[PDB]
């Protein structure tokens, strides 16, 4: 496992679905994808409301990311919130592409990779790492 690769593959697949071919363990990638999809299904209207309200530009993208990610993990970490994290970063990338701001995708993948490596690493590692996520989210695979 390498976080940069997990972030890259996740964003790449979200974007390739929209016909956007982005320049940038396989069980891990597929399991997170299905976890991500289950998540956006579970909050389908709320995701629709957040897009219709994102006000995304290159002047705000970093600040939106920083404040949302800080709120998300304010009460601590769990696998469901790491799923929401990936999903949010994916929403940001997708809205960037939809608004013709698609260079922001690179910035966003970098901020995601950084946050995982600098702030999520200890919790992920102490949980047994990405194998633990795979085992947990296997029954919904
Ligand atoms: C702890 C948390 C916070 Cl803070 C947020 C949150 O405010 N947001 C958020 C970010 C920007 C605008 C509105 C909401 C969020 C949403 C999706 C992914 C990441 C962040 N969501 N969460 C959740 C993380 C895991 C599971 C559920 C939630 C959650 O509280 N929600 C899911 C969700 C999905 C899409 C749009 C809004 C929300 C808010 C609530 C729904 N009740």
Coordinates of C-alpha atoms in Angstrom, one line a residue, residues 17-75:
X17 CA -16.4 7.7 -15.9
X18 CA -17.0 11.3 -17.1
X19 CA -14.9 10.7 -20.2
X20 CA -12.0 12.7 -18.7
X21 CA -8.8 10.8 -19.0
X22 CA -6.6 12.2 -16.3
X23 CA -2.8 12.3 -16.5
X24 CA -2.3 11.6 -12.7
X25 CA -3.0 -3.8 -4.1
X26 CA -6.0 -4.1 -6.5
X27 CA -8.5 -5.5 -3.8
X28 CA -7.9 -2.2 -1.9
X29 CA -8.8 0.0 -4.9
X30 CA -12.0 -2.0 -5.8
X31 CA -13.1 -2.2 -2.1
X32 CA -12.7 1.6 -1.6
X33 CA -14.6 2.2 -4.9
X34 CA -17.5 0.1 -3.8
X35 CA -17.4 1.7 -0.3
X36 CA -17.4 5.2 -2.0
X37 CA -20.3 4.3 -4.2
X38 CA -22.3 2.9 -1.3
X39 CA -21.6 6.1 0.6
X40 CA -22.8 8.5 -2.2
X41 CA -25.9 6.3 -2.6
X42 CA -26.7 6.5 1.1
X43 CA -26.4 10.3 1.0
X44 CA -27.6 10.8 -2.6
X45 CA -29.8 13.9 -1.9
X46 CA -27.3 15.5 0.5
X47 CA -24.6 15.1 -2.2
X48 CA -26.9 16.7 -4.7
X49 CA -27.4 19.6 -2.2
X50 CA -23.7 20.0 -1.5
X51 CA -22.8 20.3 -5.2
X52 CA -25.7 22.7 -5.7
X53 CA -23.9 25.0 -3.2
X54 CA -20.1 24.3 -3.5
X55 CA -19.0 27.7 -5.0
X56 CA -15.8 26.1 -6.2
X57 CA -13.0 28.2 -7.8
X58 CA -9.2 28.1 -7.8
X59 CA -9.3 30.9 -5.1
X60 CA -11.4 28.9 -2.7
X61 CA -10.5 25.2 -3.4
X62 CA -7.8 24.8 -0.8
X63 CA -9.8 26.6 1.9
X64 CA -12.9 24.5 1.1
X65 CA -10.8 21.3 1.4
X66 CA -9.0 22.4 4.6
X67 CA -12.2 23.4 6.5
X68 CA -14.3 20.4 5.4
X69 CA -11.5 17.9 6.2
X70 CA -10.9 19.5 9.6
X71 CA -14.7 19.3 10.4
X72 CA -15.0 15.7 9.1
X73 CA -12.3 14.4 11.6
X74 CA -13.0 16.8 14.4
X75 CA -14.6 14.1 16.6

